[PDB]
Ligand SMILES: Oc1ccc(-c2ccc(-c3cc(Nc4ccc(CNC5CC5)cc4)n[nH]3)cc2)c(O)c1
């Protein structure tokens with residue numbers, strides 16, 4: 405079955421390159437009519453140890469089955485190349501943000517955020533750090549079901565140049581530990597990224613839109629103050645930053661000063677996610693029990709709502 409063995413690509417037709425997401429093809433199932441999204445995973449099966457490691461990744465995808473994650477449907481082979489087949493979701497959060505220049509309605513933000521935190525939380529409990537949270541990487545169904553894509557397979561088989569392209573593309577959402585070169589980052593980098601989406605979704609403005617990694621740090625520190633000493637040490641030892649000094653800042657512009665209309669509950673949520681010290685950020689499950697989701701029983705009501713959406717939407 406679609407779970408047991410490699411399937412064939414004969415039943416698929418190409419419909420233009422999806423997206424952003426590397427080489428991800430939009431295809432249609434000739435037999436079912438189902439529209440799908442196909443990514444090229446392996447170039448060559450030949451390397452015996454390589455294949456060994458690919459099966460390790462595929463096995464993990466098949467175990468990351470969740471309502472708020474794009475589903476891997478099947479794996480196909482053609483010649484020496486392997487292709488992962490994912491579901492095709494209607495649109496992205498970025499698409500909604502471009503229709504709504506003043507930000508999203510409060511309840512739409514609650515529903516999108518709750519789902520994002522839920523999907524990320526599941527990743528963390530399976531020892532996966534998503535590392536690529538941004539509006540374009542968060543898909544939305546016609547029924548409003550959020551689905552996270554792009555977490556691990558393509559990134560491992562990637563060039564030093566693809567690593568570099570990724571870091572540039574996610575620049576605005578990268579936590580300070582990443583920007584200074586901490587290679588022992590943890591799950592907390594996703595929480596930071598979620599923090600970034602809070603004010604963006606409400607205000608229709610990116611939070612820290614820097615032009616470079618030094619400029620990114622500057623935007624972060626102007627709002628949130630000095631980096632922790634561990635981060636300063638990494639910065640000073642990082643060849644990327646040779647001849648560059650960390651921002652000194654006389655005047656901090658705190659978040660509530662920048663967005664004085666935002667309620668204290670919303671500000672509190674963002675600040676929790678945006679701790680400069682990643683140890684001080686909450687974990688995902690704690691976030692879902694913030695007042696922002698719990699006032700007027702939103703989280704409870706919405707969990708039931710979401711379960712019916714999911715079952716009739718799929
Ligand atoms: O390792 C990987 C690599 C790639 C993916 C991945 C899986 C699925 C998708 C995907 C994207 C997508 N839908 C989509 C993507 C972009 C747009 C933006 N254009 C708007 C519609 C006009 C709209 C819809 N459906 N499925 C994208 C990437 C993945 O899940 C894991």
Ligand SMILES: [Cl-]
Nearest residue numbers: 493494545546
């Ligand atoms: Cl859909």
